[PDB]
């Protein structure tokens, strides 16, 4: 189900000056604003950091 929130929407445009990236890593592309209660469930037992 999280692999349907990620990769449903088509990406808009390659904007150059906006480059949020990982620490010595790839450029970031998603957001996923959730509530605080769901954050303590997915990050607890479904996802990595």
């Amino acid at each position: 189900w999280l692999v349907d929130l990620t990769t449903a929407t088509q990406p808009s445009v390659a904007v150059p000056r906006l480059t949020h990236a990982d620490t010595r890593g790839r450029p970031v592309d998603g957001v996923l604003v959730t509530t605080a209660a769901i954050k303590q469930r997915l990050l607890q037992s479904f996802l990595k950091v």
Binding site: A36, A37, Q40, R41, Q44
Partner: protein, 49 residues
């Protein structure tokens, strides 16, 4: 306080319905998890939550 702060992680609602939906759910969360450890003591990852 878990139903109380999520009501106040809204703005606060003086409509008196959300006062009442607070209370009839304030009494529900208490009856469920007051004594949570020992009631859910063997359930790991619920005590983590």
């Amino acid at each position: 306080l878990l139903p109380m702060q999520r009501y106040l992680d809204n703005g606060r609602l003086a409509t008196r319905v959300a006062r009442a939906t607070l209370v009839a759910e304030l009494k529900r969360s208490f009856c469920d998890t007051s004594f949570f450890l020992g009631k859910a003591g063997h359930r790991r990852e619920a005590i983590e939550a």
